Design a protein around this ligand. Structure first.
Ligand SMILES: Nc1ncnc2c1ncn2[C@@H]1O[C@H](COP(=O)(O)OP(=O)(O)OP(=O)(O)O)[C@@H](O)[C@H]1O
Ligand SMILES: Nc1ncnc2c1ncn2[C@@H]1O[C@H](COP(=O)(O)OP(=O)(O)OP(=O)(O)O)[C@@H](O)[C@H]1O
Ligand SMILES: [Mg+2]
Ligand SMILES: [Mg+2]
Ligand SMILES: [Zn+2]
Lengths: 189, 618, 174, 595, 196
DNA sequence: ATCTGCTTTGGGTGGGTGGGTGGGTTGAGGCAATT
DNA sequence: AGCAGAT
């Protein structure tokens, strides 16, 4: 009908990327738009863009930042959680707590993929090391998800600190299996 | 430590379920009254799973560490039950512990000889297949008891082997002790020693279940004590046991190969046949009610091979052959056979082979052979050597294996004279005489032969006499009760009918499948057409508990028919003889069997006469 | 659902039944047409007919006998090893008929058995759906397990496999 | 010392190897552990790219480093799947030049080699030890041993007084793996001048077992080594990888080995409106004319559909074709092509064959003195096609030994105690000559054919190919053959042998059409007319027809209809296929009978 | 029995759904099963005749209450089952037609005349919806989020100098453009352009 | 006088660079000569 | 286990 069958009840990875690209990020303008034309937006705030000064930290929407970076007119400042040391700490936290997920942002995978693809010269650590660390973290969280899937039931379930992309991956299996369990239980009464 | 705990846990299981206790008590009572039941108990794995999951999982995955405790617990229970006042010295010295046997549902351990791999070693498995070999039963020493005359006390010694127990122990050579610890002379007391029987069989994968272009595989099995002679070659069995490995497997420096694996085999716990149907009171009453019908013969005959058009009389003959006659042996020595042999000769594509295959599938026991695929030795028996003991013996052939059953011979005319002689002897005498390799014996082969042959020129010729049309000897021909000559005569109505029937048959779709889907257990213990299973039950019942006797009226009918038949101008496709009288009596007796009657009446004689007349004079 | 094709197919399976009255002119239910159907007759009717005949009729018109798909043997096989069991052969719409049966008779033993079977099977279902092949230059187990899946499990597996495949394609898109 | 460093190096390859943005081996390992396949297939071109030094070690001493790369894989697998598992198998892929089977000699001992051949025999699986638990006879001291299957191991000779060899294995605590033996014969073309083909013994482990069947061409990567059975050693190859063009696993079990992407191609090809023409043109592109025989060969390759009735009767689903004709007709070339296109096929000459050579033969093992059964041509071709050339030279007995296997598709044996009924579901494609070499029209048809009616009725379609001297056709054939001699369409009018073979496999394992009522009525009317036509022809001539028309021909027409339907993945066979089937039957068997 | 034809029709509907799911881009509705539907409706007609005969017999006949109830119940249930199967098949086909109508901006021999009329007036409805207050949005637009502003595209099939709303594009076969995705999104949808 | 060490039966848990004039002997299948 | 050899 109006909506394809693969977009029903769930989001596509491109939809998740679209959602992620509206969060603010920090950039270093390579131009001085501030006056001592003008941006006119309706979906976000435009004061920051109208007030830019060379080599001065400022915050804008992620998609505008990517558009500016495409023109070599801004250098994205990578988040603080995306350094080598922070990823080692998160890996250690995951290793020592088999029964819980680490406190990574809800967009760590998507943002990592976007920034590695687009801004390769804006990180202060070698890119290969960061890719390896993210891969390790993904494997640990996958083990934890596999172990936690054994507690599906006709009642609620809790998956704290699970990120958006992982939840999107698992939404069909979890929802349908739990729905069938609920249907059986309800038929029982 | 753990062993005692497990024995306690199994003892608590036997307490919770009282059926096993009742069975043990009944076995002991029956033994006391007395021929003798063995000390074996069948436990349901499902009940054990319901009771204690850990014990069930251990018995399925680590039987070595969990079966001996259960056997000991059962033996302790039985001993606590025993109340025999005076135990005989043999009984006191006897080493006869209670053995455990399993049933129920094996989830993923239900396998076949092809699917057994190294991953399944040291686990309880159930295997299905055909028994192809069977060694000779030889006693095996377990315990020896001696007597010291001077000291006046008995001693004993315990022996163990790799195949007599599930846990590895130090080997014990079978040398009997001769001197006491202090140097006294010891005399063995054989009457108080303990020996058990021992046999090894080979189970082969079912040929029809094999992959494409691969010959079936087999596995070796060991049966001890009361499981020794529960199977014979050619039987379909389901064997439960523990998959093991033996020997050093080339790890000893004597063998320099360095590329040979370990030996493997199964120690059986149970054997389950897959041949006789168990009749219920409902089945018996239904059989009787049907037999009271006046057209039961026609219904049963038509029910045979519903997918073959026509051939009513051949189907009737096949029914009478499945029922058989009555075997009589006289005091003087004459031994009259009660089996019916049938020969079909006709043009190509007349459904002879399909009738043979249907008889193969329906009959309780049936062996398949062809003309060019068989041999004289392969039909009677072969001389081989026993691997276990290295002793000369005989292996039964197709005719011997089919004793008290049926043997279907396809392409009877493509055999050789040397191979035809064996069948001639078997049909003439119903026995097999063997004189080879210093062996003299007489094997029993009491089977019914149903065969199909082609004329000499590949198509029956009406002009030429029957002798010129068939290449088989007259002596061999006289041994067939009914000779059916079937011709493919082109006709319009008949062709339309047969073509419509074939087209209808070719459009069948089995339930559980979609259109265009090409065609491809759960437990081990466990004018309307009559279904094949009910036909088998009817045949079993009738040929098991009916022995009709002749009566003067049937006698008059038979004598009149024989007299008229022999001296009649009309030519016969086969020559009348005194053997025709025996065939008439046999057919009448078989038809009486069909009706579940104790006497042969006029109707049976009139049916036999009509069948023989159709066979002889079309 | 009324328009759900799988449900329409499921409602068409045959269940054993036993009539309890004497109804002339109902032969077509039996093989023969145009003959009276005597009482205590045993015959297999489609679910959409048998259910309504069983609830409508005091003594209803028919009584539902235990189907061979919910027998003791099948339950024991389910409990022993759920993953290895071949559900497709027992019935291609096993779970739907099971839910309908539970609702009809409100029996909880079957409910618990079926729930445990479904959970244990779903574990392996996700194990297989999560496994995505790779091409180095530029299997058997997965196929044998797929052959055994029931229709509803086959839909769930397809959906999960497509979701995993889409996420992997997006993440490693050059 | 060095072993730990080598293990560390191979562990860093599995954790650091990325060609773009995907870790190929880390992800391959996780995906394999999830489906219970404890192995990793590594391409040696990737290892030569990470660090050439690691390849130098793996190639200089293969049986010492391969065991240290397996333990690295196991450690990485534990790190990836277990949040704090037997030793993992390593399967290798290489593109190095293939050494001919007969060129392997002392210069290649203990080296990685690649070679091709034909598998002629496979053994029953054995069990090799991987972890022994041992005990001492006297002092009862418990110990364990660990074994890798790479030979250059035995129980300790001295205990840890205790006499020599004091240790006995405790079996209920040991673990074993699977081992298989294979015989590899060299390809017929590679063989040197005037030499018999040579064999070579091979062994595979764990996940490389039950991967091949006798008679299939394979490519092998392994180690050419030696084992002592005086100062000579018998060579053998330790398999490290198997690659084959035949999906034997799909053929024995279900449908497998077809990717969804590969499966999509087959559906697209089936949707082609004129797939029949493409397949007909794709058979023997180098043989001119003979379109009807090529359509018959397409139908034979496709096969019908087999039915098992409730009462137990089985209906044959294969099609048998006979080619009778004059010399130079290209019957042998058609047979040699069909042997090469079919997934399973055997080419045999009726003269150089025997009753036991076909079917199965009884053989005695010289060691055990026990008779066993070995399959012949019809068993080796099970599930495929047998091409019996020179069908007229076969002896009467050897030909009679084929009736049951051709009709009932089973080989009943009763010899030397062995009593069984094997399975042989094969299609026979036979070529023969008339009595006088050329079909002489002057004499009656009963004089040109020495085959009996029984054997002939078993053939679905009989082609009596006659060579007529026509100037136009002769010029056309001359031009075609000269073009062949002096001289690639692949534009939707022809598909290569590989694609056609894969499509045959897919169709056979995916479709089994059924007749609709209209087709049944049509075929039934046609059978009545054909039988009447034989009777009118017979009444005219005293002689009894030499080519028969029995119920088997009706079943053959049904099989041809079903094969034509299956060709296009149509679950139902309609009249549009019945008409073609009737046309082919009239073009071959009624044509032969009319003369 | 009395629902075998409906079961066969629903099986064909299932096959149609499976084909639609498997197919990647090109979907063609199988030929409308006119024959099976004709047979089903004929069967419903005989069932109606049976109900009328039963009522007539009850009005003047020896029939009893229980027997009449049972037969009148078994006939009604059969009619209901046939109706359900028919409606399920038709609804599946209509859903695929809706999907096709939305995929285009707004062969046919397979469809029955009723389905042809349905599709025509449904496209009319879609265009009417597009004409309303949602004009600024291209309701039958692309459902993939916009990611890149400028894309490289290649002309897949030769055509004249098509004059789109956004401008003039000289669609020469085998020629590349550096343009904004928003402008050439329709041409990509039709197949005149490819993203590469 | 004591300690150290090899090899059977006969059989494939020694083999075919030890052979069959050192014994393990029927069954099947192919080939020449006889027909 | 009996017999063949080295300390
Ligand atoms: N009366 C019949 N009804 C149905 N099928 C028949 C009939 N007669 C022959 N056939 C068909 O004949 C086919 C093969 O013939 P069959 O093998 O039964 O003949 P046969 O008498 O053993 O021939 P031959 O002399 O070649 O050994 C079977 O598929 C069966 O379908
Ligand atoms: N279109 C063709 N028709 C006939 N022969 C051809 C054709 N193309 C090539 N040939 C030649 O046919 C020869 C092969 O012989 P062919 O297969 O025709 O013999 P046959 O008739 O089957 O056998 P025989 O002569 O023993 O009866 C090869 O030399 C090949 O070059
Ligand atoms: Mg036959
Ligand atoms: Mg030739
Ligand atoms: Zn010791």
């Amino acid at each position: 009908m109006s909506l394809p069958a693969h977009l029903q009840q769930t989001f596509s990875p491109e939809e998740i990327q679209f959602i992620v690209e509206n969060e603010p990020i920090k950039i270093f303008p390579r131009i001085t738009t501030r006056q001592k034309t003008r941006w006119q937006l309706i979906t976000t705030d435009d004061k920051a863009l109208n007030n830019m000064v060379a080599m001065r930290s400022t915050e804008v929407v992620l998609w505008i930042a990517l558009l500016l970076k495409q023109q070599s007119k801004c250098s994205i400042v990578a988040p603080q959680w995306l350094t080598t040391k922070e990823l080692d700490r998160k890996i250690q936290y995951e290793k020592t707590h088999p029964d819980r997920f680490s406190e990574l942002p809800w967009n760590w995978l998507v943002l990592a993929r976007i920034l590695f693809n687009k801004a390769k010269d804006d990180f202060h650590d070698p890119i290969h090391e960061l890719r390896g660390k993210i891969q390790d973290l993904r494997e640990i969280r996958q083990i934890k998800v596999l172990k936690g899937l054994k507690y599906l039931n006709e009642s609620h379930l809790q998956l704290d600190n699970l990120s958006l992309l992982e939840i999107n991956e698992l939404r069909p299996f979890i929802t349908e299996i739990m729905d069938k369990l609920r249907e059986i239980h309800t038929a029982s009464l | 430590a753990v062993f005692g705990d497990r024995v306690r846990r199994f003892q608590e299981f036997l307490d919770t379920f009282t059926s096993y206790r009742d069975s043990v008590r009944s076995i002991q009572v029956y033994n006391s009254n007395n021929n003798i039941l063995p000390h074996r108990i069948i436990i349901s794995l499902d009940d054990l799973r319901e009771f204690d999951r850990s014990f069930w999982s251990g018995i399925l995955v680590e039987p070595a560490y969990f079966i001996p405790p259960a056997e000991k617990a059962l033996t302790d229970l039985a001993d606590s039950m025993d109340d025999v006042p005076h135990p005989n010295a043999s009984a006191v010295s006897s080493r006869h512990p209670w053995k455990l046997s399993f049933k129920g549902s094996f989830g993923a351990h239900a396998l076949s000889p092809r699917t057994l791999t190294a991953q399944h070693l040291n686990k309880l498995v159930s295997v299905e297949g055909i028994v192809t070999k069977t060694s000779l039963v030889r006693p095996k020493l377990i315990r020896s008891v001696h007597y010291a005359a001077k000291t006046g006390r008995f001693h004993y010694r315990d022996y163990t082997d790799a195949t007599t127990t599930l846990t590895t122990r130090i080997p014990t050579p079978a040398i009997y002790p001769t001197e006491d610890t202090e140097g006294n002379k010891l005399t063995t007391e054989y009457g108080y020693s303990t020996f058990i029987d021992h046999q090894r069989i080979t189970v082969q994968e079912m040929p029809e279940m094999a992959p494409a272009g691969q010959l079936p595989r087999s596995i070796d099995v060991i049966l001890d004590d009361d499981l020794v002679d529960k199977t014979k070659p050619g039987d379909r069995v389901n064997v439960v046991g523990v998959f093991k490995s033996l020997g050093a497997g080339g790890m000893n420096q004597s063998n320099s190969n360095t590329l040979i694996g370990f030996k493997t085999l199964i120690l059986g716990n149970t054997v389950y046949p897959l041949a006789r149907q168990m009749l219920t009171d409902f089945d018996i009453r239904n059989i009787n009610k049907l037999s009271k019908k006046k057209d039961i013969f026609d219904i049963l005959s038509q029910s045979l091979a519903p997918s073959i058009y026509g051939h009513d009389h051949i189907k009737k003959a096949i029914l009478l052959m499945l029922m058989g006659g009555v075997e009589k042996n006289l005091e003087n020595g004459s031994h009259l056979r009660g089996d019916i042999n049938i020969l079909m000769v006709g043009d190509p594509s007349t459904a002879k082979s399909q009738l043979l295959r249907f008889v193969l599938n329906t009959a309780s026991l049936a062996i398949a052979t062809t003309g060019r695929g068989s041999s004289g030795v392969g039909l009677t028996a072969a001389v081989t050597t026993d691997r276990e003991t290295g002793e000369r013996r005989l292996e039964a052939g197709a005719m011997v294996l089919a004793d008290r059953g049926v043997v279907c011979i396809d392409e009877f005319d493509k055999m050789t004279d040397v191979d035809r002689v064996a069948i001639h002897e078997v049909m003439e005498q119903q026995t097999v005489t063997i004189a080879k390799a210093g062996i003299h014996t007489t094997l029993n082969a009491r089977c019914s032969v149903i065969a199909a042959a082609n004329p000499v020129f590949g198509q029956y010729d009406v002009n030429r006499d029957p002798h010129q049309n068939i290449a088989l000897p007259d002596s061999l021909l006289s041994r067939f009760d009914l000779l059916f000559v079937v011709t493919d005569d082109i006709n319009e109505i008949r062709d339309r009918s047969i073509s419509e029937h074939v087209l209808r048959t070719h459009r069948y779709l089995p339930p559980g499948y979609l259109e265009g889907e090409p065609v491809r257990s759960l437990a081990v213990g466990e004018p309307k057409l009559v279904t094949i299973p009910f036909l088998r039950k009817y045949v079993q019942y009738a040929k098991e508990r009916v022995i009709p006797q002749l009566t003067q009226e049937a006698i008059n009918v038979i004598v009149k028919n024989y007299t008229d038949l022999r001296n009649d101008d009309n030519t016969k496709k086969s020559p009348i003889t005194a053997r025709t009288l025996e065939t008439l009596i046999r057919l009448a007796t078989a038809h009486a069997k069909v009706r579940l009657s104790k006497t042969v009446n006029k109707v049976d004689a009139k049916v036999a006469a009509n069948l023989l007349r159709f066979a002889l004079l079309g | 659902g009324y328009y759900d094709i799988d449900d329409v197919l499921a409602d068409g399976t045959e269940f054993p039944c036993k009539f309890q009255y004497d109804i002339p002119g109902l032969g077509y239910l039996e093989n023969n047409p145009g003959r009276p159907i005597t009482k205590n007759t045993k015959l297999s009717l489609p679910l959409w007919l048998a259910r309504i005949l069983a609830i409508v009729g005091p003594v209803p018109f028919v009584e539902l006998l235990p189907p061979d798909m919910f027998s003791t043997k099948v339950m024991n096989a389910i409990k022993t090893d759920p993953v290895a069991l071949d559900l497709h052969s027992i019935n291609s719409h096993f779970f739907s008929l099971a839910i309908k049966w539970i609702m009809l008779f409100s029996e909880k033993e079957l409910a618990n058995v079926v729930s445990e079977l479904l959970l244990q099977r779903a574990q392996e279902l996700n194990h297989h759906a999560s496994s995505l092949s790779i091409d180095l230059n530029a299997n058997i187990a997965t196929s044998t397990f797929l052959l055994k899946l029931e229709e509803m499990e086959k839909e769930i597996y397809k959906k999960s496999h497509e979701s995993y495949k889409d996420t992997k394609r997006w993440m490693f898109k050059k | 010392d060095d072993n730990t460093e080598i293990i560390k190096s191979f562990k860093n390859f599995i954790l650091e190897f990325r060609l773009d943005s995907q870790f190929i081996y880390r992800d391959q390992l996780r995906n394999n552990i999830l489906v219970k396949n404890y192995s990793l297939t590594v391409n040696m071109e990737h290892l030569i790219g990470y660090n050439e030094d690691i390849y130098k070690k793996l190639s200089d001493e293969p049986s010492d480093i391969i065991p240290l790369f397996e333990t690295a894989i196991t450690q990485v697998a534990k790190r990836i799947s277990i949040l704090s598992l037997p030793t993992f198998q390593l399967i290798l892929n290489s593109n190095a030049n293939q050494i001919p089977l007969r060129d392997l000699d002392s210069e290649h001992v203990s080296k990685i080699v690649r070679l091709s051949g034909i598998i002629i025999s496979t053994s029953v699986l054995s069990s090799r030890a991987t972890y022994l638990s041992i005990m001492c006879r006297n002092c009862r001291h418990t110990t364990s041993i660990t074994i890798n299957n790479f030979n250059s191991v035995s129980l300790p000779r001295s205990c840890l007084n205790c006499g020599p060899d004091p240790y006995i294995i405790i079996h209920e605590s040991s673990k074993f793996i699977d081992q298989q033996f294979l015989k590899l014969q060299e390809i017929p073309e590679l063989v040197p001048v005037g030499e018999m083909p040579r064999n070579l013994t091979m062994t595979c482990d764990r996940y490389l077992t039950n991967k091949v069947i006798p008679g299939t061409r394979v490519t092998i990567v392994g180690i050419y080594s030696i084992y002592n059975s005086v100062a000579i050693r018998t060579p053998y190859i330790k398999i490290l990888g198997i690659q084959s063009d035949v999906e034997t696993s799909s053929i024995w079990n279900s449908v497998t080995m077809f990717t969804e992407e590969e499966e999509e191609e087959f559906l697209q090809l089936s949707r082609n409106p004129k797939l029949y023409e493409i397949l007909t043109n794709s058979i023997a592109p180098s043989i001119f004319g003979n379109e009807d025989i090529k359509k018959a060969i397409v139908c034979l390759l496709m096969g019908g559909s087999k039915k098992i009735l409730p009462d137990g009767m089985r209906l044959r689903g294969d099609i048998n074709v006979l080619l009778l004709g004059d010399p130079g007709t290209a019957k042998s070339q058609l047979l040699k092509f069909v042997e090469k296109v079919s997934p399973i096929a055997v080419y045999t000459s009726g003269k150089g064959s025997s009753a036991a050579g076909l079917t199965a033969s009884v053989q005695r093992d010289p060691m055990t003195r026990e008779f066993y059964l070995e399959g012949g041509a019809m068993v080796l071709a099970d599930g495929g096609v047998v091409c019996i050339d020179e069908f007229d030279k076969m002896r009467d007995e050897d030909r009679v030994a084929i009736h049951e296997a051709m009709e009932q598709q089973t080989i009943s044996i009763a010899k030397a105690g062995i009593t069984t009924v094997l399975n042989s579901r094969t299609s026979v494609l036979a070529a023969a000559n008339p009595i006088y070499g050329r079909y002489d029209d002057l004499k009656s048809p009963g004089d040109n054919i020495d085959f009996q009616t029984t054997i002939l009725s078993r053939f679905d379609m009989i082609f009596i190919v006659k060579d007529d001297h026509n100037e136009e056709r002769d010029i056309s054939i001359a031009n075609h053959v000269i073009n062949i001699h002096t001289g690639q369409e692949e534009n939707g009018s022809e598909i290569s042998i590989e694609k056609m073979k894969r499509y045959i496999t897919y169709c056979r394992l995916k479709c089994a059409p059924r007749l609709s009522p209209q087709a049944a009525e049509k075929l039934s009317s046609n059978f009545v007319t054909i039988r009447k036509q034989l009777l009118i022809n017979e009444l005219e001539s005293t002689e009894r027809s030499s080519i028969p028309i029995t119920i088997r021909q009706l079943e053959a027409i049904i099989r041809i209809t079903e094969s034509l339907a299956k060709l296009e993945l149509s679950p139902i066979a309609q009249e549009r296929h019945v008409d073609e089937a009737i046309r082919l039957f009239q073009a071959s068997t009624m044509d032969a009978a009319s003369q | 029995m009395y629902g075998d034809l409906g079961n066969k029709l629903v099986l064909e509907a299932k096959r149609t759904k499976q084909l639609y799911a498997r197919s990647n881009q090109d979907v063609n509705l199988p030929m409308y099963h006119e024959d099976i539907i004709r047979n089903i409706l004929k069967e419903v007609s005989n069932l109606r005749k049976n109900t009328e005969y039963l009522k007539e017999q009850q009005q003047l006949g020896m029939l009893d209450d229980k027997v009449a109830k049972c037969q009148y119940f078994v006939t009604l249930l059969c009619m209901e089952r046939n109706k359900r199967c028919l409606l399920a098949y038709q609804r599946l086909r209509t859903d695929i037609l809706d999907s096709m109508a939305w995929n285009n901006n707004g062969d046919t021999n397979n469809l029955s005349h009723q389905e042809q009329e349905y599709l025509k007036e449904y496209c009319d409805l879609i265009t009417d919806l597009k004409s309303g207050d949602l004009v600024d949005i291209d309701l039958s637009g692309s459902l993939v989020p916009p990611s890149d502003v400028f894309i490289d595209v290649r002309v897949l099939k030769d055509a004249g100098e098509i004059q789109t709303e956004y401008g003039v594009f000289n669609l020469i076969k085998d020629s590349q453009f550096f343009v904004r995705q928003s402008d050439v999104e329709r041409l990509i949808q039709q197949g005149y352009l490819q993203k590469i």
